[PDB]
Amino acid sequence: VNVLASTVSGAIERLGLTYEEVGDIVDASPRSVARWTAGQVVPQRLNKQRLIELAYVADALAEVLPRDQANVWMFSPNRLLEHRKPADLVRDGEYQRVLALIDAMAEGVFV
Amino acid sequence: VNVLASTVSGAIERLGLTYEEVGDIVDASPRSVARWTAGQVVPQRLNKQRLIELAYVADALAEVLPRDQANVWMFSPNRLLEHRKPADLVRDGEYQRVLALIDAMAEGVFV
Amino acid sequence: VNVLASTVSGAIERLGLTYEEVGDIVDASPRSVARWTAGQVVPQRLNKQRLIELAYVADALAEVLPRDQANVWMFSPNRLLEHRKPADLVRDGEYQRVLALIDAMAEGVFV
């Protein structure tokens, strides 16, 4: 397995995201996500940039929440993000805003 | 009270708009509208350009309708504006079209 | 009757479209479509470019389906067009995609 794929796979695994969840975020079938993270060839549609961005967010989020709560956080409407889910922001290319929020959480910014 | 604020306040008052109504048009809280028109400091979100545009429309409208009917007109779907409310046009930056209609009304243009 | 109008009229007639159907595709009243195809003056709104595009599609479609089925095809959600109706594609300026599909149909492309 190529190291890029296993590194991304490791980041997502520590968040406990399912292949279905990852698929909805990176616009790919669950099987395509499973194959990609296993380092197999994927001719289908799959947004690699979104997968890497998801990995950034998963790793960053582990600093501020334990796995269970981190997982739930991804799919919970967040009043700090105008009642949007962080998973949807990542899906739609706004991972930087999610990373900013996580850094605020890590610095104990009063909400 | 600064004269810019009291002039705008005077224009809106002659139309009998509530602070809630004005707030929905200029994207501000009713309290922020109340404070602004009273010439007090307003650090919050408030679109000054929209407030002035609303004032233009209120003053112009007084030429063609009495207060009661002018007030209602602002919030009534107008078939001459593709069944949109003049208040919504003002809110969304289309005050010029509303001013054009008022001038047509003032010139007895056949509808 | 001018030949441009009668040529377009001929193309649509062979598809059996009603003036109501044509009107919804070219953004005109049924009466305006009836007058235009009869070569009469039409001061009203009518998108001539869309009418010609519709004619292109009607003529092309006759190569691959008989009249009854061609007519129905125009208004049937097509899975090859992401479950959109060919009539709606024509209406919205995407006649070229519809012509491409028809040419694929004419070449027996496996679907």
Next chain:
Amino acid sequence: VNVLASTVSGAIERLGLTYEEVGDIVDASPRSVARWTAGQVVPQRLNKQRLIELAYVADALAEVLPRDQANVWMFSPNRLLEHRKPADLVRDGEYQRVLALIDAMAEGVFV
């Protein structure tokens, strides 16, 4: 000669424009302009909308300047139009601004 072409041609000739000048404003060859204004068929590129807009301007301009000066004015950098030529505004779709300036001229607006 059809009345539309005849009317547009009359406006052009009264201003004394050459077909080369008109061609540059309406994005056509001089021969195409000559043929169009003579009511003859023109399969080549010609922006009819611009020809009509130019006729508007030519006719309006006659109210405020005599022929020879009107002609010069079309091609003179005008400080009221940010040092642009009225003919270039017409070419580039800004005929309305030119008509507005002519109206101001006709009302003796101080410059």
Next chain:
Amino acid sequence: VNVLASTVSGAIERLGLTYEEVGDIVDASPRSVARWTAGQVVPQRLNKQRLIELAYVADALAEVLPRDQANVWMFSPNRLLEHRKPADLVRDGEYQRVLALIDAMAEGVFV
């Protein structure tokens, strides 16, 4: 002199900019800048947002360069900004990039 103008003016003077230089950055005449910074009324065109952004940059820049060199730096093509002048970035709305470069300078980032 109102405190806003006084504060912005102080930042400008510490950097030693001329009102002609400031005028070019904020799209105003030199007289308009002089009057604005003196807290006097300015009915002419002046981009207040740009004046404030320039004050941000001037104040930030003082952390990393002494006055005379700070001044030269504003007008020197900078290879870290794709050979553009910081003053031109500020003029064109890119003050954030300039502030980011100053922060990198202040942190001894290797170039």
Next chain:
Amino acid sequence: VNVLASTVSGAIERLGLTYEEVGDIVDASPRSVARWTAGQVVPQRLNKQRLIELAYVADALAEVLPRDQANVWMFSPNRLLEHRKPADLVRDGEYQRVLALIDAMAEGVFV
């Protein structure tokens, strides 16, 4: 050397392009192009999409011009492309138009 790079490289060499010429078309340094086509790692900027599009064009062009003339043709202002060079169209994302012209050449379209 991976087969993708080998295949693209073959197309380039058959046309006789220099790595400087290729670099200009694909927005890369000549060294980056040389390394990429040699299947070596390239961390620097390189537009892979443009390299592939250039390979399409080079291979297509071989059908209609021999090597030396094909090479000259890429850098010759072409009246069929509004006096632009095919290489510049490829650089700027318009390779499809270039392929379409090559197809017309291959079908003896009268020019």
Next chain:
Amino acid sequence: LDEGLVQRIDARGTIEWSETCYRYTGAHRDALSGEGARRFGGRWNPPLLFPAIYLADSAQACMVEVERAAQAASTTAEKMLEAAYRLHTIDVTDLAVLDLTTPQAREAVGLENDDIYGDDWSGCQAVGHAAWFLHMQGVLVPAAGGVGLVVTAYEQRTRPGQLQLRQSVDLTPALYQELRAT
């Protein structure tokens, strides 16, 4: 600007029309101004190209238009006329107009009932535009209560005295009810 439409309208040509006409405006407005119709558009003129004045051939027909404007403003004529309006009596003399007062004339330029009564002005506006384009002085049109007159680019197109303000009176609720009557 349709060649066929312009051709057809030219073929109809004009008639010279004289009548005592009526217009209402806000009390402050000039009885012969047409800038309002230019700024917004009207049923028989596109916006932005030329001033246009709308008149009726009787006070009664004018009052019907007052009522229609009131209705569009979501109120009644009596309430609308609490704001200061004036009724103008304007003599029109030998105005060269396109006569669209018959269904045959309207059909000849492609207009039918939906065009004159319905919400879509595009047809009537194109016809008014073409008439103005041909230097006609106006268009005679059906009006809910009688005959309407649309005068296009009055200032440029008309000779001395073709339009003459004869009278202006306050259009009170009382005057309206009096004039509206059968």
Next chain:
Amino acid sequence: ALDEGLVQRIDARGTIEWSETCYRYTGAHRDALSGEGARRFGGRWNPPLLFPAIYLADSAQACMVEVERAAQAASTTAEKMLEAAYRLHTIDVTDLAVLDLTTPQAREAVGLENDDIYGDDWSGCQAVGHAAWFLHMQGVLVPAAGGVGLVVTAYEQRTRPGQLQLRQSVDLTPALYQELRAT
């Protein structure tokens, strides 16, 4: 923008009541009191698209100077321009409540200098005219190249009966222009 500071300063200046026999020129077909052209295009002392405005001078001679300036902006001369049909309107103005900018003190108070008044840039004057209109002033009295100018803003809505009264209209020929320019 409609700057609060400028509005406040202009309000502080207030108005004076001004009466004078004034002069305006228009194309021969235009109404002497129409202000729609200034609204459509803008004028030195008014932004476009908000209100009608009428430009008058305080003498026939000052009016002729403005005819020259317009001719010059049109790349020609008053003598040639007036070959097209224009008319000269004599308009009596009575008790018009105007912002008085004829003094240098007043112009300094609202941030204007001669550059604003004669230079190519109208922005400062337009902001000032905008504010005066916004404050319901009936107009602005301004310096002009040939004397004093009056800008009357939203005349129809803002003036009582007979504040502006058309007294006379005459054909403004090249010969008359030269006569009035001298005398």
Next chain:
Amino acid sequence: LDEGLVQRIDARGTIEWSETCYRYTGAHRDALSGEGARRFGGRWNPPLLFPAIYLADSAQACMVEVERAAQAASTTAEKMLEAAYRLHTIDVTDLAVLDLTTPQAREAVGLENDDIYGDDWSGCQAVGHAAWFLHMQGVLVPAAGGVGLVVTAYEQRTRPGQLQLRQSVDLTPALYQELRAT
């Protein structure tokens, strides 16, 4: 254009394939044209890059495709074939093709059942694109009724006689029902 996918497809390489194949077209179309698939795309080719011809390894398998096209056009084969179509018998000789007729071969290039049956063509199209990119002459694919052949850029890539039209007959409703049979 994925480096890994191209690498993997190259590793599979080609086989030389000969078979009597079948295609249907509109009666006016050239039996060996592939521009339709280029203009629109097909399951095994992206649009706009190269012509592609779709063939079946039996008349029966071809009729299944007729039925599938009819279904996509919201009708039946019998009704669709009221329009003039023709059935072409085309001999294929020594064509160098990527063999994807086994699930193992398909799995090796990352394709599974959803890819061959489902609405998303992206996987099959990427594989067809890579095969064409490597100058393979075509792709052997599963076809609802048997084996399908996708011939990519026929004109350029093939030698004299590799594809030969042997026969063309009117594809009537009667011929369809006859050939469709078990």
Next chain:
Amino acid sequence: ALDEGLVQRIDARGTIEWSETCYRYTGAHRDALSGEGARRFGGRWNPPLLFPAIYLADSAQACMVEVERAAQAASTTAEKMLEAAYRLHTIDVTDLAVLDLTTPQAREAVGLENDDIYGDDWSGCQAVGHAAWFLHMQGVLVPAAGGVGLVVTAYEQRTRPGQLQLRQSVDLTPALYQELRAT
């Protein structure tokens, strides 16, 4: 646009039935009767993306002249271009219903002049070819630099069996080109 006036004029001209032995050149791998290239790019006498079109000349010599013109647009010569593999197709045309633009009267009637036919701008010719196709004409007979050209539009849909018949295809070498260009 598809101008009503142009369509009407072309319809008024109508068609003639034309039969001739004609010539076309293509890359050696291309079908003699394919018209997809003209559709993809456009040609002098057809807009792109609407219909296939085939360009033929009325003699081998006229065809060679077109080979030269294409070579020249490709910045080279027929002699060098034909080092790449091309073939010359002899195609019999029978009773093709064509718009006849070989006379100056006909070209004048549809607004075309020599500039349109040989100049860099294809727009006029393309509009005319578009209209002929739109009117279901089978093609357009045109002047060409070396003789007469035939543009056959949507051949597949619009022609009866055997109206176009491929008689012969030969390799178009530089030597053959020179031979045919002369003889």
Next chain:
Amino acid sequence: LDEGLVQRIDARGTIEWSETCYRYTGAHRDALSGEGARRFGGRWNPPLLFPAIYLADSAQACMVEVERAAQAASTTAEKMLEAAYRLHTIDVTDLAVLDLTTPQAREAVGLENDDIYGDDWSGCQAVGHAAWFLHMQGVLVPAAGGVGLVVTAYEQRTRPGQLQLRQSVDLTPALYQELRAT
């Protein structure tokens, strides 16, 4: 940047404030970093212009903020603190701050209860921005559990020793429950 607001804030001026304060961060973060608030924004600072540090005037008040952050992250303080956080004790000395701890002071700069409790930060952010703009060292604010301190651009604006880290301890669930208590 409102002239009136800046004027009004200048008029209030600053007070010199000294207190032992408390902040919590992730265990790896620097106790005096303010980049997080800069990247995202906070109630009392717009994003992107300056670092800002949020502190509370007691451990209890700080724990209330821990709870509020947990709530915003859709969980509880006890669960959130399963991830490694640390509680910092930071002595603040003679910090020149805008004192907004009274409703009168807040009203003077246009802030009311909705501004300090509601979802719209725009008012508080504008006030914090103006304070930083005037080179104030911070803003004293109401905090759900007591007094909050927002230190703006610490590194630039403060003298040696004005902020001093005195202590850092693991903020475990146990420490939280202990400190949260009444």
Next chain:
Amino acid sequence: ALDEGLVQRIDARGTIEWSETCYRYTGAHRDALSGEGARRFGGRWNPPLLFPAIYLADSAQACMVEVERAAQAASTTAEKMLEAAYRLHTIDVTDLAVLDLTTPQAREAVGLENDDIYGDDWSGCQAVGHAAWFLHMQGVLVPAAGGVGLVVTAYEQRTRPGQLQLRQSVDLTPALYQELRAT
């Protein structure tokens, strides 16, 4: 992009554990261990907006050379730049797991040459630093104009207690710069 090939190659190189006394300069008001500036702007060896990064040199002299290079990019000299308040930090680095690019073999393996390291274009170095950080390496050891550089990436999250230890900070005056640049 985050190229798979580059990531694989860098992983194959792996890390070494590096210990040295290193040097960094900052404005006098900045924290010796903060890496936010490199994150906000980017640095030669890191893309912006993803992670903090700290740039250190392996001697005071090498650090002074970097002060010169920054001064030069700022159109001035170290002597003049250091009139603004800067400080020189001595930072002990212990067992940092770093990608070692100090050898030419290593630089060749990841596609870098001297052009990448000293030229105006940072893209290649940034991609390499990005990948090292992505692979959870603690930093990159690089050649520098005056010796060896260390780029420490996401220090706070990725280092065990005391891997970076601030030993000393002194005012970096023009005089000290000249002294350290020599000695």
